[PDB]
Design a protein around this ligand. Structure first.
Ligand SMILES: OC[C@H]1O[C@H](O[C@H]2[C@H](O)[C@@H](O)[C@@H](O)O[C@@H]2CO)[C@H](O)[C@@H](O)[C@@H]1O
Lengths: 555, 18
């Protein structure tokens, strides 16, 4: 239950929460109502989980893109500002929080990514992405790098991916057709290729995250980064001589950041909706409230016209809005959660070399579409979707079901799909439903094959082929040999994701050599797996998932 | 052997992984 007579507010950890707490202080002075500001990790995910049970904060801040999904889930109160109040904010900021014709949140501020550069290293920053390699080469000669930014969140890579023609959905005539998706298209491929080539050529590192990029920039090690207005405070503290400017072009077209409007929604389960409204309209959305938050971490271009006017001469804000005009306002529709998850997965897979750029985008769009059109809304529907595609691939090739060359790609894609959706729905992998599905293929497709091992009669890459061949062998072996012939309590034979483990007696630590799947695995080091005193494979207590110890493979 | 994936995914080694 949410407690009545106070306000709990959630906001992300990169924003000015200390400044927002000072606004809370003013509210409590006047009204006696205590305002607590929190910044949980993964709050955009945590909000719908706790609010679904009628719990959570009274007020949730995020960019507007997540809010339609929240509204669809019944988690948000419709807000009711009057005409006089609406007039105090820019019409286009209201449009960002308008979903099915209703206002679902209060708009706070317009955010867009810019190119941030170190004037002491690079007084004339590059106008194009194409000149960044040669520039990095020069800088590396001096112990510096050209560019570091957060590669882990697709927000930061989308500007490049969109530049030459990637898009989420197109807003035409007031509507979004969620069947027309621009993730798997030539322009997205060109921009993602360019990003991947930067990594291949060691101009960037696939592991770079927010904290690493911020620290490299703020220490003077990298001449450029990509970030939003919230980041300028820490730069100021570091005393780097920086400029904020237009993002580089790609193939002669602007980088297109996805523009967010920091927004504040009211939990449908709050017993304090009136207090929340008062706080938001009469304390936060005033020149004085917004100043308090902005002084802590810059907001960007605020939605309140009076304060936006006061700050409009900041060249950093001007740069922010020039980038915003080149990009596109994010949709607020429910499909955004799946869109972002898709782009994240594509980028991670392509940047690591796990998939080609073409395969990464193609799979990302396929699995996103499954959610966008409502076919897949949970793991049970996901598994049905993965199986149905697999069946469609296997049915016409029946005479070749025992030929690894014909079935390897369908079988690998089956696992990619089952595992994608497990991660998506916060489940482990392997898991019992996915295992049931894999056993089913062994039963209906592979039962006439003479061998436990896969055998022959585009193909998978080296690593994937090694993993999938081992997987197939493992399931076939379980099918062959269900029985335990010895007396006693035994863990059963099992596939852990990477390796097959024989049945063993309760209270055994089984050992095998590290698999030769990865260039950074030592195939002379050991993998261990514990079969507990009750005959159950050990589960890691941090996750409660059955867990093999690969920690020594990698050292 | 350079045709193998470079880096084992850390997430699969973590307590959340395999
Ligand atoms: O990376 C995907 C992520 O992008 C946006 O999140 C931004 C947010 O808008 C900014 O305020 C800032 O906090 O950085 C975030 C990126 O890490 C979308 O708003 C978000 O829904 C999406 O998952």
């Amino acid at each position: 239950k949410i407690e009545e007579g106070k306000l709990v507010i959630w906001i992300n950890g990169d924003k000015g929460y200390n400044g927002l707490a000072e606004v809370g202080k003013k509210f409590e002075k006047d009204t006696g109502i205590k305002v607590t500001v929190e910044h949980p990790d993964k709050l955009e995910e945590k909000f719908p989980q706790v609010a679904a049970t009628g719990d959570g904060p009274d007020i949730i801040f995020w960019a507007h893109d997540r809010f339609g999904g929240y509204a669809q889930s019944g988690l948000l109160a419709e807000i009711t500002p009057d005409k006089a109040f609406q007039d105090k904010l820019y019409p286009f900021t209201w449009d960002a929080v308008r979903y099915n014709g209703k206002l679902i949140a209060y708009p706070i501020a317009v955010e867009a990514l810019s190119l941030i550069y170190n004037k002491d290293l690079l007084p004339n920053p590059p106008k194009t992405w194409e000149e960044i390699p040669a520039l990095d080469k020069e800088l590396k000669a001096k112990g510096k790098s050209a560019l570091m930014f957060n590669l882990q969140e697709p927000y930061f890579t989308w500007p490049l991916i969109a530049a030459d023609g990637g898009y989420a959905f197109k807003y035409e005539n007031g509507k979004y057709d969620i069947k027309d998706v621009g993730v798997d298209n030539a322009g997205a491929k060109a921009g993602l290729t360019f990003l991947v080539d930067l990594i291949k050529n060691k101009h960037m590192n696939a592991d770079t995250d927010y904290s690493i990029a911020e620290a490299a920039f703020n220490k003077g090690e990298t001449a450029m980064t990509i970030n939003g207005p919230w980041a300028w405070s820490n730069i100021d503290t570091s005393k780097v001589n920086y400029g904020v400017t237009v993002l580089p072009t790609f193939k002669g077209q602007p980088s297109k950041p996805f523009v967010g409007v920091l927004s504040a929604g009211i939990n449908a389960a709050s017993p304090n909706k009136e207090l929340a409204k008062e706080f938001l309209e009469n304390y936060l959305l005033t020149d004085e409230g917004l100043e308090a938050v902005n002084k802590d971490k810059p907001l960007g271009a605020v939605a309140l016209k009076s304060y936006e006017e006061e700050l409009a001469k900041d060249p950093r804000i001007a740069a922010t809005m020039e980038n915003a005009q080149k990009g596109e306002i994010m949709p607020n529709i429910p499909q955004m959660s799946a869109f972002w998850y898709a782009v994240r997965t594509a980028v991670i897979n392509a940047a690591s070399g796990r998939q080609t750029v073409d395969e990464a985008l193609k799979d990302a769009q396929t699995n996103a579409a499954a959610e966008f059109g409502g076919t897949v809304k949970n793991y049970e529907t996901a598994v049905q979707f993965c199986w149905n595609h697999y069946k469609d691939q296997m049915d016409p090739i029946e005479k070749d079901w025992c030929d690894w060359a014909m079935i390897s790609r369908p079988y690998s894609t089956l696992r990619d799909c089952l595992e994608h959706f497990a991660e998506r729905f916060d489940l482990g992998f392997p898991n019992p439903l996915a295992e049931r599905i894999i056993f089913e293929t062994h039963q209906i497709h592979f039962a006439n094959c003479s061998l436990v091992q896969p055998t022959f009669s585009i193909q998978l890459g080296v690593t994937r082929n090694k993993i999938m061949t081992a997987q197939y062998e493992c399931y076939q072996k379980i099918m062959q040999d269900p029985i335990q012939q010895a007396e006693g309590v035994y863990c059963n034979r099992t596939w852990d994701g990477w390796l097959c483990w024989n049945d063993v007696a309760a209270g055994t630590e089984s050992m095998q050599l590290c698999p030769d799947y990865f260039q950074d695995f030592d195939p002379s080091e050991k993998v261990t797996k514990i079969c507990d005193q009750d005959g159950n494979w050990f589960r890691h207590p941090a996750s409660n998932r059955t867990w093999t110890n690969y920690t020594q493979c990698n050292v | 052997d350079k045709d193998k994936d470079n880096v084992a995914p850390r997430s699969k080694i973590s307590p959340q992984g395999y």
